[PDB]
Design a protein around this ligand. Structure first.
Ligand SMILES: Nc1ncnc2c1ncn2[C@@H]1O[C@H](COP(=O)(O)OP(=O)(O)NP(=O)(O)O)[C@@H](O)[C@H]1O
Ligand SMILES: Nc1ncnc2c1ncn2[C@@H]1O[C@H](COP(=O)(O)OP(=O)(O)NP(=O)(O)O)[C@@H](O)[C@H]1O
Ligand SMILES: [Mg+2]
Ligand SMILES: [Mg+2]
Ligand SMILES: [Zn+2]
Lengths: 656, 613, 347
DNA sequence: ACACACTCTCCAATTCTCTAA
DNA sequence: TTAGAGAATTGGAGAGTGTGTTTTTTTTTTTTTTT
């Protein structure tokens, strides 16, 4: 009933929008996109607010006043999706190329309807019915920066923000599968042969049932309406949920969450377990009909997604733009990348260089193989660290957990073999049975870190056997019978029996693992804490420096930063280097010697069990990883001898 | 109607007379106006109910007996005062029509209206009351609509409307249907302007009488409270709290036609006006405290004074007292630029004969640390001590609850092997991680551990190895910074001294009591708590080359020289030296660690480790 | 309905009823009452309604002259003998057992220090015929609980966690808080209670951190126990019951049994014990301190040339205070110290 | 307040009848 | 034989009224404390 004044007039802002779309350039930037839309080449338009800020600054420096459109579309974001769409529809250019127009049902229907009106004469339909494109806003760069550039945790999203454009940081908990949602519905009248349309915005609607057209009415033609899919307009819909990071929850509270909606080409971007910076519009969800009359003033709410930024680029997302090319050329031209990359893993830890080199080869991994008859062979590498207390095992393990784009960390005592693999939970109130994957599934195509491996129960450790070699999980339980994919490499850490390693016994007595499991690790590294006045002094001088400066001590060596390291590793995981006959003869001859030496010494104090055929393929996998890191397309004997050295060094700790 | 204006005038006279409230309005406004140009303070003021009594008794009793007729005009007058004071020009679209007035809160002298949930009675309805109890439940936060704004497409005019519900206002009005208008009076189609509309936060809680007051094992009684705007989420379950607000009734009570024959009663609530906690830990320093703390720190031997003032009722064990003081101060926690973490908190273990004050000394820490949890070793399971699953929801254990605090474990030797191994992560990585059916999560647990145990043979046997006397694995003993062995060696003068000491202790009488009625210098514990709090918040000592020169030499000699030492020596021993030196420098309020601190830390570690100084 | 009215083999019938204004909050559960009210029906089959009643009416520290008697008792020169004689008078002999029960009923004095440490007031005794004394103690004590070693539930003596969500319940150590508790066979204690009673006795608390529960329970009580090892160290005094076989005693008991089949009284003594606990909490004189410390070092030296420990010196002090409490003397004296060490011969 | 089921009422469309050219 | 003036019978347009709606196992997988 009443009315107020406000500082904003939308006519001025509409004029600014139509100038911006036809003038801005880094021809003008957005007219190329609209030409691609007109050619049917492109389905969505992404508006950059950095452009609008730049445009405002340039117009100001030319000595003229202008409205602050950037804050104006952040404060009340919902309304401007319509203004930009009307401007785009007004200014859309004509096609540059032939289209085959007859493929469109709506074109035929509207052409015939226009012809009917033309004959009869001897808005027509809602404009939403012919918008072939989607439109989204991208928030301000924080380095140019405003609230949309600054991430909020899910607790900080108060009721003040309803209507605004914001950014949210958290973990995704669940994702729905895609289904269609109506936008414009189409009907046919039987007796008078005429078509009518209806537009849907709310969660529910009543379909039409009477032909209220004036011509039909004046012919007293009370015809029947029928619905049609073939000329209705749908859009893809998906719903998700986001939840705050566990390390940001205040003490004694339960974590909170938000509902996310996604439409258009942005669909199936999110996935469960992702850590992500989502940005969008935060809105209420009104009730409808009789429910609204007795629901009260408490409103449900949700987030309309507009753009999504991931924290770590998955290795599958790689493509060699020249921006990346220029950076990998730095490492390639500098040379000796193997040592530099290994030295760059956890620089705050002194020494341990061979362990770091082994863990770099774990990050790269071997080549997947699939024979013409259907047999397949594991490409992943498995590694284990066995050693005394206080030698940085947990610390080094947790450092590698940062580099990998997909990975999880777990400890032996806190873990169930079920929850480690996959569980059949009677989760809903409806008594339904549903399968939910465990840690080894969440680490699919990544690394799984298992600390305190010696504390985990002997029965529960057997769950890992199938995943380690076959990279799959098989379940046959109440109402569920399926196989899941688990393409994951395992890294584990343990103390020997009795804690500190005991020289009175053999290595196998100290290790205390069964034969079938000890074989599934490609490398097991044995590391012992033996005092030395000389080495202890150097280690202490290094650690004390680190505590003093927060920096590793350096005179010669500069580590590569983790980002450039990820780019190099991601580029290196694409190569698939092949073997050759000269190399094959050498490794074939090496394998015989290993088994003969094992047979000779099964009695001996220097025994470590017997070399199985899985030790041959371990050599091939390590060799191929080394070939990948030098960006080759061919394994070289130089790789094989290093792969043998790296296996030999694991046992030298036994000899003080 | 006319009476509303006069009440606004009379409260304006009060606000002009008692000027300390104008300063409050103005200071909040200028603070908010400053940082807006770069957190924000709420538009709320607390008035002393005594000032209002001395100013006008007729207004005082009106606020206190008829709040629905006196609180609204008073609050209106406060908003006019804040609005007439100068404010930033050219407000934005949302600021122009925020629908956000200032709000009141009260303190002091409620008299007869200070109550508890058991005694709140139908006579007190519509009065302003104060209640005390324990929070038991809290709802989720929800937004609530109060105003909406609409733009008319053809005419270019902005329209608006307001909404009400029975819990939003002290006075009573016709309820509103929560519908959005789609069309103008003149037939123009409307659009809704989110971001210009106004929504507020809402939360319901429940408060119950304290269990100490429950009669005869009878059922306890409780009330529901309504909170909104600024008051949301300032409490959690288990809090002891005192709430101020108006006590009111709701609904039709079955007189709107029902099957009950109207035997059922009306519903009732308290509308939260102000909330205060109860202490049942933290203290806030006055200026004089800063002066005294800084002056005392320049004595020659502050460490001796402070350490001997811990548990003066316990004779002897000087070194354990010094170790506990350094534990309460702690080291400095490091986070490196690559995300790597280096531990800061000190863990202590003590093992010894029966009756040698182990449990009695362990009990003292629980009553001087700001956050402390206590448990017996056999009364706790691995999951209960770290974390457990429920319904999926994950529930914290004792080590997760004391995050930045200390945890005390008595009868540590009785804990089973299956329970002990759950602790190996928490004492170094300072986290808890679970991987069970339907759950994977990491939790933080940053505390310091102090614990007591009995040796294997019931008394310590010097004629057998320390490993034979102490049945724990080497990987666990390595995680304790200081390991103390203590025994009851029989000697004449020692026995005489201790016995005379406990007899002098048992002859104490508290100050306010006649004899037989039932109930160097030492700083008082209430001052020592302030000293520890100040030192832990305001000083962060950085390491120096002179300290490092001592630390490196001591570590390499101690590790390499062959001796009958009672604990394994590893890379973690070096960190114990750095932590102890940093904590001693912090006692001294020094901005940097010096050679003296490193020397003292070495002389404490040598005593505990090699048994002799 | 009244228990002595119900027809045999049937569970009792009941009614629901309403009251308002001054008739509210006038009664509590378990009380027998008489009611006047209108009997009527209300809405809540065919043409059928529930009945109820509207109520219109319901029916259901010391004086000066009391404490004068207690004061006259306090100045009697043989009061200690009188109270010992008044305890289980049918039981022959066993003088020191009766003396120890008097001290257990009277207790020492609680104290709190400037550094916040807290000093225990209670007493604990163990007995190795014996069934009668625990029942007598249960009757004479102002507050009392009686149990056998297995306990009344899966809580046992101390407490336990049970299960569906988990919960916790306390046994007969938590329930007797503030009073006395007596155990009828201490050897039948359960495994969890064997370890948990250490905290319950030394700390006067029970603490649990299991299945997400994290709480501490109060256990402020004096324990009397009997049976038929290291657990004896928890008690202040231990004694073994003794018997005599006079035929006249059994004949007298049998004659009394036939009579039912065909010195100070309990209530007065209970009220006196209550009065003394409320009025007096006495302190050691310096002479007692020199005496006790000299005796302590003497016993340790004698044992060294041939154990006593501080946790037993602090028990002798509590016994000494409890002996001075009978006289209402505000100070304890060498007279009490002598009888305290004399009675300390548990062996 | 929002789709439905059911009731009530008035008005004009229709067919039938009579009269005269 | 056509047609036009007047009367009677019926249909359904459409207006009105009242109404209803939100909201002890038994079998099977998994974690936890208890003997
Ligand atoms: N070479 C090293 N360089 C730097 N710090 C080291 C080195 N070796 C050991 N440390 C320190 O040793 C401490 C303990 O490391 P941590 O990873 O917890 O040991 P761990 O091998 O997991 N021992 P445990 O879990 O008992 O088997 C850390 O603070 C490290 O800084
Ligand atoms: N200076 C002291 N030295 C030793 N014990 C003392 C001292 N002062 C008091 N005590 C008393 O010693 C008794 C036993 O102390 P407590 O701390 O329980 O020993 P403990 O080491 O825990 N023995 P235990 O429970 O068998 O492991 C208490 O009653 C204390 O009051
Ligand atoms: Mg570790
Ligand atoms: Mg003790
Ligand atoms: Zn039609």
């Amino acid at each position: 009933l009443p009315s107020i004044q406000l500082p904003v007039d939308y006519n001025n802002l509409f004029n600014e929008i139509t100038d911006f779309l036809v003038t801005f350039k880094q021809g003008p930037k957005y007219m190329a996109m609209l030409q691609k839309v007109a050619n049917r080449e492109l389905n969505s338009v992404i508006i950059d607010l950095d452009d609008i800020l730049q445009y405002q600054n340039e117009k100001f420096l030319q000595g003229t006043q202008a409205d602050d459109l950037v804050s104006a579309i952040q404060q009340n974001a919902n309304h401007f999706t319509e203004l930009f769409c009307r401007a785009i529809d007004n200014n859309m250019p004509l096609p540059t190329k032939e289209i085959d127009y007859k493929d469109d049902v709506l074109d035929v229907i509207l052409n015939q309807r226009r012809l009917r009106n033309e004959r009869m004469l001897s808005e027509l339909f809602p404009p939403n019915l012919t918008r072939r494109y989607f439109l989204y806003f991208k928030p301000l760069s924080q380095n140019c920066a405003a609230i949309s550039s600054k991430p909020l945790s899910v607790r900080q999203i108060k009721g003040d923000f309803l209507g605004q454009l914001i950014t949210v940081r958290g973990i995704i908990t669940r994702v729905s599968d895609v289904k269609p949602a109506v936008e414009v519905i189409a009907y046919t009248c039987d007796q008078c042969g005429y078509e009518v349309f209806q537009e849907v915005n709310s969660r529910t609607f009543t379909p039409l049932s009477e032909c209220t057209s004036e011509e039909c009415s004046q012919n007293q033609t009370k015809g029947q309406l029928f619905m049609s899919t073939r000329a209705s307009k749908f859009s893809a819909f998906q719903e998700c949920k986001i939840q705050e990071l566990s390390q940001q929850v205040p003490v004694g509270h339960i974590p909170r969450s938000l509902n996310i909606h996604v439409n258009g080409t942005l669909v199936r971007s999110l996935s469960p377990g992702d850590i992500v910076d989502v940005t969008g519009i935060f809105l209420p969800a009104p009730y409808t009909g009789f429910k609204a009359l007795k629901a009260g003033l408490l409103t449900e709410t949700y987030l309309e997604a507009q753009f999504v930024r991931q924290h770590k680029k998955k290795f599958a997302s790689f493509s060699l733009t020249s921006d990346v090319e220029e950076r990998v050329m730095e490492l390639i031209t500098s040379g000796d990348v193997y040592n530099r990359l290994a030295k760059s893993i956890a620089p705050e830890i002194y020494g341990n260089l061979d362990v770091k080199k082994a863990l770099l080869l774990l990050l790269v991994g071997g080549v997947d193989k699939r024979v013409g008859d259907g047999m397949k062979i594991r490409g992943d590498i498995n590694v284990c660290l066995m050693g005394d207390p206080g030698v940085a095992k947990s610390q080094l393990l947790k450092a590698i957990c940062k580099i990998s784009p997909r990975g999880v960390y777990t400890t032996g005592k806190g873990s169930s073999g079920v929850g480690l693999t996959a569980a059949v939970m009677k989760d809903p109130v409806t008594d339904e049975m549903i399968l939910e994957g465990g840690a080894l599934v969440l680490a699919d195509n990544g690394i799984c870190c298992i600390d305190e491996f010696d504390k985990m129960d002997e029965s529960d450790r057997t769950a890992i056997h199938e995943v380690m070699e076959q990279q799959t999980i098989s379940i046959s339980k109440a109402g569920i019978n399926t196989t899941l994919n688990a393409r994951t490499s395992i890294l584990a850490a343990a103390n020997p029996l009795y804690g500190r390693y005991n020289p009175r016994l053999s290595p196998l007595d100290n290790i205390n693992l069964p034969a079938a499991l000890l074989s599934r690790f490609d490398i097991l590294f044995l590391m012992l804490d033996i005092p030395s006045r000389d080495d202890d002094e150097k280690l202490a001088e290094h650690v004390t420096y680190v505590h003093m400066h927060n920096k590793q001590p350096d005179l010669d060596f500069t580590p590569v930063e983790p980002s450039k390291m990820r780019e190099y590793i991601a580029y290196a995981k694409t190569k698939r280097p092949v073997m050759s006959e000269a190399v094959n003869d050498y490794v074939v001859q090496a394998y015989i010697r290993l088994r003969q030496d094992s047979k000779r010494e099964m009695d001996s104090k220097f025994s470590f069990g017997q070399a199985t055929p899985r030790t041959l393929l371990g050599i091939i996998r390590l060799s191929q990883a080394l070939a990948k890191l030098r960006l080759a397309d061919m394994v070289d004997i130089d790789d094989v001898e290093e792969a043998l050295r790296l296996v030999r060094v694991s046992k030298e700790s036994l000899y003080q | 109607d006319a009476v509303f204006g006069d009440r606004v005038r009379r409260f304006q006279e009060f606000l002009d007379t008692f000027t300390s409230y104008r300063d409050s309005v103005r200071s909040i406004q200028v603070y908010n106006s400053n940082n807006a140009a770069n957190n924000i303070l709420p538009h709320r003021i607390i008035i002393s109910l005594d000032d209002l009594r001395e100013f006008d008794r007729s207004f005082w009793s009106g606020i206190l007996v008829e709040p629905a007729y006196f609180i609204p005009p008073a609050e209106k007058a406060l908003t006019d005062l804040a609005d007439s004071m100068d404010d930033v020009p050219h407000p934005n679209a949302s600021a122009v029509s925020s629908r956000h007035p200032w709000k009141l809160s009260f303190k002091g002298s409620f008299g007869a209206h200070a109550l508890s949930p058991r005694t709140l009675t139908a006579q007190h309805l519509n009065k302003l009351v104060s209640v005390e109890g324990i929070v038991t439940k809290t709802s989720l936060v929800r937004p609530k609509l109060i105003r909406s704004v609409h733009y008319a497409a053809k005419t270019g005019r902005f329209h608006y409307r307001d909404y009400t519900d029975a819990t939003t206002t002290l006075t009573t009005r016709i309820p509103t249907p929560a519908i959005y208008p789609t069309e103008d009076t003149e037939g123009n189609k409307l659009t809704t302007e989110y971001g210009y509309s106004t929504f507020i936060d809402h939360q319901r809680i429940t408060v119950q009488e304290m269990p100490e007051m429950a009669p005869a094992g009878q059922l306890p009684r409780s009330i529901d409270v309504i909170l909104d705007d600024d008051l949301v989420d300032k409490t959690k379950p288990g809090d002891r709290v005192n709430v101020v607000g108006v006590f009111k009734s709701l609904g039709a009570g079955g007189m709107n036609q029902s099957n009950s024959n109207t035997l059922i009663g009306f519903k009732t609530l308290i509308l939260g006006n102000t909330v205060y906690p109860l202490h049942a830990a933290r203290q806030m320093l006055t200026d004089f405290d800063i002066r005294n703390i800084n002056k005392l720190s320049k004595k020659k031997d502050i460490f001796d004074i402070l350490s001997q003032s811990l548990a003066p009722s316990i004779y002897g064990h000087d070194h354990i007292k010094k170790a506990i003081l350094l534990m309460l101060m702690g080291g400095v926690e490091k986070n490196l630029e690559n995300g790597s973490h280096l531990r800061g908190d000190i863990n202590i273990l003590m093992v010894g004969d029966p009756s040698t004050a182990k449990s009695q000394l362990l009990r003292f820490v629980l009553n001087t640390a700001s956050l402390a949890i206590a448990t017996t070793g056999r009364g706790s399971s691995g999951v209960g001590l770290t974390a457990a699953v429920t319904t999926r929801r994950l529930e914290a254990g004792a080590m997760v609850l004391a995050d930045r605090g200390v945890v005390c474990i008595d009868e540590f030797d009785k804990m089973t092997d299956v329970d002990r191994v759950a602790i190996h992560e928490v004492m170094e990585q300072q986290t808890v991680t679970i991987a069970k059916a339907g759950i994977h999560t990491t939790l933080n647990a940053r505390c310091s551990v102090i614990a007591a145990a009995n040796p294997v043979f019931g008394q310590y046997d010097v004629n057998r190895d320390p490993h034979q006397n102490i049945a724990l694995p080497d990987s666990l003993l390595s995680r304790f910074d200081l390991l103390f062995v203590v025994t009851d060696d029989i000697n004449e003068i020692r026995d005489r001294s201790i016995s005379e000491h406990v007899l002098r202790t048992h002859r104490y009488l508290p100050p306010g009591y006649l004899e037989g009625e039932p109930v160097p210098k030492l700083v008082t514990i209430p001052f020592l708590r302030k000293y520890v709090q100040y030192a832990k918040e305001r000083v962060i000592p950085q390491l120096t080359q002179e300290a490092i020169n001592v630390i490196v030499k001591n570590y390499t000699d101690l590790r390499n020289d062959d001796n009958t030492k009672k604990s394994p020596i590893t890379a973690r021993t070096l960190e114990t030296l750095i932590r102890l030196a940093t904590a001693h420098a912090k006692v001294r309020l020094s901005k940097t660690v010096n050679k003296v601190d490193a020397k003292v830390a070495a002389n404490l570690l040598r005593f505990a480790l090699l048994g002799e100084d | 309905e009244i228990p002595e009215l119900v027809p045999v083999g049937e569970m009792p019938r009941n009614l629901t009823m309403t009251c308002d204004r001054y008739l509210t909050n006038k009664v509590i559960p378990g009380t027998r009452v008489t009611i006047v009210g209108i009997y009527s029906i209300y809405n809540s089959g065919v043409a059928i309604r529930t009945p109820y009643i509207k109520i219109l009416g319901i029916q259901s520290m010391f004086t000066e002259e009391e404490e004068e008697e207690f004061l006259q008792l306090s100045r009697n020169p043989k009061l200690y003998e009188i109270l010992t004689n008044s305890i289980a008078p049918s039981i022959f002999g066993n003088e020191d057992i009766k003396k120890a029960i008097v001290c257990l009923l009277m207790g020492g004095s609680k104290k709190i220090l400037p550094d916040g440490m807290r000093l225990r007031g209670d007493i604990n005794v163990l007995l190795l015929a014996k069934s009668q004394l625990l029942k007598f103690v249960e009757k004479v004590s102002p507050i009392a609980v009686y149990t056998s070693g297995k306990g009344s539930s899966a809580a046992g003596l101390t407490a336990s966690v049970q299960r569906r969500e988990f919960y916790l319940e306390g046994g007969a150590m938590v329930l007797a808080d503030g009073g006395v508790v007596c155990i009828d066979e201490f050897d039948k204690m359960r495994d969890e209670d064997r370890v948990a009673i250490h905290e319950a006795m030394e700390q006067q608390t029970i603490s649990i951190a299991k299945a997400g529960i994290t709480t501490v329970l109060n256990s402020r009580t004096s324990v009397l126990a009997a049976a038929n090892t290291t657990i004896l160290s928890r008690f202040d005094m231990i004694f073994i019951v003794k018997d005599d076989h006079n035929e006249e005693r059994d004949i007298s008991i049998a004659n009394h049994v036939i009579n039912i089949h065909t010195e100070i009284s309990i209530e007065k003594m209970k009220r006196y014990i209550t009065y003394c606990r409320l009025k007096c909490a006495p302190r050691l004189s310096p002479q007692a301190a020199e005496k006790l410390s000299s005796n302590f070092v003497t016993i340790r030296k004698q044992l060294l040339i041939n154990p006593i420990t501080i946790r037993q010196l602090e028990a002798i002090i509590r016994i000494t205070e409890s002996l001075a409490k009978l006289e209402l003397s505000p100070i304890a004296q060498e007279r009490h110290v002598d009888e305290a060490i004399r009675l300390f011969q548990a062996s």
